[PDB]
DNA sequence: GTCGTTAGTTGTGGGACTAAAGGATATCGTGAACCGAAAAATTAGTGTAACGGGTATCCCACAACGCTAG
């Protein structure tokens, strides 16, 4: 349980699965600046719930 | 001639092998018979109505005047 890529070590202490997270697919925005991202409203409203 | 030593194999054993998503499975073979345990179902037994004063509360209606004479 605490060897290799799965173990305790490598699985849940060095790397975890966190909250107030998202994940989608990537379009190109060519008008926005260097600084900034376009996050979808559902998104959003559940990133920012609290 | 014989015994311990050193270095170079040689065979064998233990330890590594991106990151992101997802994430459904199927799982044989049989020997008997009696006793004990507890969990469940079935059965057997008892019953009020108004009254006296006296007084606590409720709803429900009404009152809570005006004038004259000795």
Redesign the pocket.
Known sequence: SL???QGRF?QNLL?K?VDYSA?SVIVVGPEMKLYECGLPKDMAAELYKP
């Open positions: 060897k290799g890529k490598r790397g699965r994940r």
